[PDB]
Design a protein around this ligand. Structure first.
Ligand SMILES: [Mg+2]
Ligand SMILES: [Mg+2]
Ligand SMILES: [Mg+2]
Ligand SMILES: [Mg+2]
Ligand SMILES: [Mg+2]
Ligand SMILES: [Mg+2]
Ligand SMILES: [Mg+2]
Ligand SMILES: [Mg+2]
Ligand SMILES: [Mg+2]
Ligand SMILES: [Mg+2]
Ligand SMILES: [Mg+2]
Ligand SMILES: [Mg+2]
Ligand SMILES: [Mg+2]
Ligand SMILES: [Mg+2]
Ligand SMILES: [Mg+2]
Ligand SMILES: [Mg+2]
Ligand SMILES: [Mg+2]
Ligand SMILES: [Mg+2]
Ligand SMILES: [Mg+2]
Ligand SMILES: [Mg+2]
Ligand SMILES: [Mg+2]
Ligand SMILES: [Mg+2]
Ligand SMILES: [Mg+2]
Ligand SMILES: [Mg+2]
Ligand SMILES: [Mg+2]
Ligand SMILES: [Mg+2]
Ligand SMILES: [Mg+2]
Ligand SMILES: [Mg+2]
Ligand SMILES: [Mg+2]
Ligand SMILES: [Mg+2]
Ligand SMILES: [Mg+2]
Ligand SMILES: [Mg+2]
Ligand SMILES: [Mg+2]
Ligand SMILES: [Mg+2]
Ligand SMILES: [Mg+2]
Ligand SMILES: [Mg+2]
Ligand SMILES: [Mg+2]
Ligand SMILES: [Mg+2]
Ligand SMILES: [Mg+2]
Ligand SMILES: [Mg+2]
Ligand SMILES: [Mg+2]
Ligand SMILES: [Mg+2]
Ligand SMILES: [Mg+2]
Ligand SMILES: [Mg+2]
Ligand SMILES: [Mg+2]
Ligand SMILES: [Mg+2]
Ligand SMILES: [Mg+2]
Ligand SMILES: [Mg+2]
Ligand SMILES: [Mg+2]
Ligand SMILES: [Mg+2]
Ligand SMILES: [Mg+2]
Ligand SMILES: [Mg+2]
Ligand SMILES: [Mg+2]
Ligand SMILES: [Mg+2]
Ligand SMILES: [Mg+2]
Lengths: 183, 141, 148, 124, 52
RNA sequence: GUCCCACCCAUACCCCGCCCUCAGGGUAGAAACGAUGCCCUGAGGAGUAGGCGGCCGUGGAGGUCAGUGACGAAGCCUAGG
RNA sequence: AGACUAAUCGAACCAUCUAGUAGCUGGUUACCGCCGAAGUUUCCCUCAGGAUAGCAGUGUCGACCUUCAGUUUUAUGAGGU
RNA sequence: CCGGGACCGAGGACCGCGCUCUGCAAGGAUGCUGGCGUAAUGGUCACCAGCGACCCGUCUUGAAACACGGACCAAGGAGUCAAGGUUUUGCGCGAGUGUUUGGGUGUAAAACCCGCACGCGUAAUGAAAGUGAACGUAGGUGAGAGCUUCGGCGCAUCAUCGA
RNA sequence: AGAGACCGAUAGCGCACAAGUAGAGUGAUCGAAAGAUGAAAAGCACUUUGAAAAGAGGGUUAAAUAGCACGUGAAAUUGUUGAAAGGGAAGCGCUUGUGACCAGACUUGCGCCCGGCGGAUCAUCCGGUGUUCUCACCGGUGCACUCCGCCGGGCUCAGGCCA
């Protein structure tokens, strides 16, 4: 006997992508070599972010890029391991350099119209192997419909599952003291 | 471009017409594959530079790939036949595979394959007759 | 595809993953919404708070066409004009001509105002308009006129 | 020819793991089956009963799948397949399929004699 | 008889796949790896001078 | 009843060999690799109800081995391997 | 006499509704590997049964913050066996 | 500091730490010699011998039970399908998305092409008449991967005060 | 009338066959089992034993190990022959012994030297061709001490099992 509380405990994070895209497999080979033989933590973080699933890679917008393109960051390189989406609200798009997993057709058009360049993760590794003069970005993780139903209960102000919305659907008893109580 | 040897290996890694898979190991019946193993290193039909050895009526026949005419398969093979001497063929193959940096890692396999074919073209000695151990008593009658 | 599902892994194991003491009988607990007030109250009160009761007055022979008025905010107003003309206006080369946007032809009835507006005069023809949308369009040099 | 030099081969077991109570009823085959009884003595590992197969009986990775001569079996069907064993004559051995005709059997044996490949079942 | 026999797939993915197959039709190693006998063809995008 | 020597054996403890699981490292100016591979190091292994992963068989469908066969396919018997 | 009405009577026989419902008995089909329980809280014409919390597995993400502890020490409060 | 006995030999060019330093007992066994080359070593099956060993499946706190089912063999024999939800994995497009009710065409129940409407999403809140989202570089404070001209800038998310 | 990622004689309609038939009930009604010799009957002339049925011969056929109880012919259960055990059960696990039977490995390879024999040109050179454009091939030139096989002798090295 050895009297341990845990034994044969597995890891908790992904160690390889579950997707079988061949080009993604090549990209993983590239960044696995860079991360193995480079001191930059940027390579290890990008490598880990290549394994993540779609719900862990939310889209970022042009507006969100323009938000972080202020206060002396107009000359840095934007790195987003996700898709990049055009925003219809932004009327004037500044000049920027973007390295992204993929771009929408309209976002690509508006960037090159403004005078930018759209890169690729492999060209990014070819130009800045250590990631110097770059800023990494993420999308809004909790901005999903399914998250609003999480942890439903009394006094939680979450969203319930109803087949429709109206005065006949829910409300009534337990939502107003005029009919019993409130939550 | 969008196509390369690594991508073709990615596509053909799991299944291809040349694959012979069963228990205890896997093999490949490819013309440009030495040692007849299934691996990226020895997969002739995916790499840009490859070698192949075929037995002739008297000697060895060596085929190589010309990188300049990949899209023209009718004229994409450099062929030559060696039927003079074992040592001379060994030297020619080794120089052909390790003098200008054209797959210098396959020198040992190419020479061994030529050695085996030449060994396999010699006349065979007759095997000695079999003996009996427990049926000798039965056959005594 | 039945070749890979959990029912194939239960072959050879008695009770098929449903337990020995609890034997997966026909209909324990009732069918459907049975027991809403008696033995499923804890579920119908932790979740779905508000199932029972009456609220509000009733409407006879409702026709939803009487209540049709989709709305559009003000920050998407410039997205209605085509891109080629839009970039000319935003670049600022016209300086003497103004566009007239017809919301009804695009399928809208009320013009709400939520975002910001660039300083270019425009003309909007809408069935309804908010007070802030009227103010914001007025400070940009434009005017809004009701059209019905 | 002789095979490559290798470490000695140890089996760790020779018996066949017969099925419980298959020696008393003729409706049960001898193929092993896991007993799922709530009070089975074999499942409870009582002393003096049949053993149970475990992963701890596995063989060495170096000598796995190789016959006592030193080779590994390889199933062939005609004369074109046996030529795949050109580079492996000290590690692999040939095996003729059971449905190959007698005329093609001697063609296979003749070619294998030229290549030096050992044939396990040739005396026929 | 009312089980789901046919399936529905997006026209965008149909066009993506048929374009991928067309692109893969110009790679000679894949032709050999699929079991074709193309050891004696001059050009892999074979074209005929409207003789047919 | 009390005290003192020597000796016997558990799936327990120590050392060594082998299997698996988990964890940590090395491998491209590629003379390179079933990169899902190979090499180095450490620890662990009991189990009903139950959960997950990997593999083995049966009837059919598409592709491929330019696969086997009346010089004997499938099936069946066999203290023969 | 609850007797008899085709070996059938305290409500005949044949087909259909009908695969009538069952909180109740019985059964539920190949292998290996890893983890591994509960009979307890609250409500129910509830007590051979359910919902709810607990115990368990799997899939992860953010740290690698250094964070924590069915434990000891020092200082300082409460108790009525 | 000197004797006696038992079990074991993993690894496979050199590299290291060291010593008594023409070398060695220092990151894992080599040297010499004998008999036999076949039933000799080894393996399968049957029997005698030493020790061990209660009948399976099931309900149960507890089954070898004086608890129930099972004389024997062959074939058949039990979590499926549809509609509607939900979370997670892969894929396409993306502020939009969905060709197939229908029409055109065809080597004809296949494949290919076309469009007006429509569904869900882009705006909520009230029983209802109704109204309808920027004081600020779309805010302040404490943590935050990463980047940096070394001063600082600070994603996601968590907490908190405001609009 | 045309078709199928349907079933394949305990399946598929109750019915692949003289099936809504045979059969049961006074009646309304209930309702089965059962496909396959061989390419062609060429379906065994005749002799003998026997009352007969049958048997033994002899015939047809590629086959009668296909004979109208007919393709292939599994298990429960039974007969003969061969081997073995048994003092109120048998069966089973670990480890030797005896008896029957048996798969592998082994039977040499490599190199060097000396001699014999048959040879047929090795290096070199120049002409042409291909190519990774610097290496190759082909055409001619060589001349015994080069190269290339055969045999006999010798030598070294390694190779089965048990100690
Ligand atoms: Mg242990
Ligand atoms: Mg009231
Ligand atoms: Mg279980
Ligand atoms: Mg049960
Ligand atoms: Mg239950
Ligand atoms: Mg075994
Ligand atoms: Mg028990
Ligand atoms: Mg690793
Ligand atoms: Mg276990
Ligand atoms: Mg199959
Ligand atoms: Mg079927
Ligand atoms: Mg054939
Ligand atoms: Mg056969
Ligand atoms: Mg009475
Ligand atoms: Mg009567
Ligand atoms: Mg009735
Ligand atoms: Mg039923
Ligand atoms: Mg019933
Ligand atoms: Mg455990
Ligand atoms: Mg009540
Ligand atoms: Mg009970
Ligand atoms: Mg700390
Ligand atoms: Mg007291
Ligand atoms: Mg008290
Ligand atoms: Mg020894
Ligand atoms: Mg000796
Ligand atoms: Mg013996
Ligand atoms: Mg006993
Ligand atoms: Mg009891
Ligand atoms: Mg029991
Ligand atoms: Mg009793
Ligand atoms: Mg009972
Ligand atoms: Mg009974
Ligand atoms: Mg069956
Ligand atoms: Mg569904
Ligand atoms: Mg729409
Ligand atoms: Mg801060
Ligand atoms: Mg930091
Ligand atoms: Mg029958
Ligand atoms: Mg039938
Ligand atoms: Mg029938
Ligand atoms: Mg029959
Ligand atoms: Mg007769
Ligand atoms: Mg007669
Ligand atoms: Mg026959
Ligand atoms: Mg027959
Ligand atoms: Mg019969
Ligand atoms: Mg028969
Ligand atoms: Mg029998
Ligand atoms: Mg006995
Ligand atoms: Mg006994
Ligand atoms: Mg000559
Ligand atoms: Mg000459
Ligand atoms: Mg010459
Ligand atoms: Mg001459």
């Amino acid at each position: 006997g050895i009297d341990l509380r845990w034994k044969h405990v597995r890891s908790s994070h992904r160690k390889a992508p579950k997707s079988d895209n061949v080009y993604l497999k090549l990209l993983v080979k590239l960044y696995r070599f860079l991360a193995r033989r480079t001191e930059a933590p940027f390579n290890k973080v990008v490598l880990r972010r290549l394994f993540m699933s779609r719900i862990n890679r939310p889209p970022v917008s042009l507006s969100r890029i323009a938000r972080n393109l202020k206060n002396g960051n107009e000359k840095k390189t934007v790195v987003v391991v996700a898709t990049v989406t055009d925003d219809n609200r932004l009327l004037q798009v500044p000049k920027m350099e973007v390295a992204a997993l993929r771009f929408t057709a309209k976002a690509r058009a508006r960037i090159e119209a403004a005078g930018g360049r759209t890169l690729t993760l492999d060209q990014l590794a070819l130009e800045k192997p250590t990631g110097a003069n770059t800023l990494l970005l993420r999308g809004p993780k909790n901005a999903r419909e399914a998250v609003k139903h999480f942890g439903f209960g009394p006094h939680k102000h979450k969203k319930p599952y109803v087949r429709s919305k109206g005065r006949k659907f829910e409300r009534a008893r337990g939502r107003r003291r005029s009919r019993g109580f409130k939550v | 471009s969008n196509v390369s040897a690594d991508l073709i290996w990615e596509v053909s890694r799991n299944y291809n017409s040349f694959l012979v898979k069963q228990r205890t190991g896997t093999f490949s019946r490819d013309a440009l594959n030495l040692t007849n193993q299934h691996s990226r290193k020895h997969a002739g039909f995916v790499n840009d530079k490859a070698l192949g050895i075929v037995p002739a009526e008297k000697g060895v026949k060596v085929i190589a790939k010309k990188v300049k005419a990949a899209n023209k398969p009718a004229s994409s093979l450099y062929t030559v036949t060696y039927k003079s001497t074992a040592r001379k063929a060994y030297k020619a193959i080794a120089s052909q595979a390790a003098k200008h940096g054209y797959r210098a890692d396959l020198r040992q396999a190419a020479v061994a394959r030529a050695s085996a074919i030449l060994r396999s073209q010699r006349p065979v000695k007759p095997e000695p007759p079999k003996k009996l151990r427990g049926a000798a008593a039965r056959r005594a009658a | 595809p039945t070749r890979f599902s959990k029912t194939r892994k239960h072959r050879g194991h008695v009770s098929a993953g449903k337990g020995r003491v609890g034997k997966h009988r026909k209909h324990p607990g009732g069918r459907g919404m049975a027991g809403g007030q008696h033995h499923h109250r804890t579920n119908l009160d932790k979740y779905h708070p508000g199932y029972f009761g009456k609220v509000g007055m009733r409407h006879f022979h409702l026709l939803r066409n009487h209540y049709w008025r989709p709305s559009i905010n003000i920050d998407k107003l410039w997205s209605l004009v085509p891109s080629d003309v839009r970039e000319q206006y935003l670049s600022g080369q016209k300086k003497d001509t103004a566009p007239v946007i017809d919301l009804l032809s695009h399928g809208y009835a009320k013009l709400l105002g939520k975002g910001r507006l660039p300083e270019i005069p425009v003309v909007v023809r809408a069935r309804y308009v908010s007070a802030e949308a009227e103010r914001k369009v007025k400070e940009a040099g434009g005017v809004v006129e009701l059209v019905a | 020819v002789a095979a490559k030099k290798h470490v000695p081969i140890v089996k760790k077991r020779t018996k066949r793991f017969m099925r419980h109570q298959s020696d008393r009823f003729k409706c049960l085959d001898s193929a092993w089956r896991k007993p799922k009884g709530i009070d089975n003595r074999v499942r409870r590992r009582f002393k003096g009963n049949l053993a149970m197969p475990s992963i701890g009986y596995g063989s060495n990775k170096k000598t796995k799948h190789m016959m006592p001569s030193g080779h590994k079996a390889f199933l062939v069907h005609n004369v074109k397949d046996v030529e795949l064993l050109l580079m492996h004559n000290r590690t692999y051995a040939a095996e003729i399929a059971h449905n190959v005709s007698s005329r093609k059997r001697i063609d296979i044996i003749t070619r294998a004699k030229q290549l030096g490949v050992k044939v396990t079942n040739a005396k026929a | 008889i009312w089980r789901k026999w046919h399936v529905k797939i997006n026209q965008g993915q149909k066009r993506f796949a048929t374009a991928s197959a067309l692109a893969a039709s110009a790679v000679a190693p894949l032709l050999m790896a699929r079991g074709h006998q193309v050891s004696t063809v001059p050009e892999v995008p074979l074209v005929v001078d409207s003789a047919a």
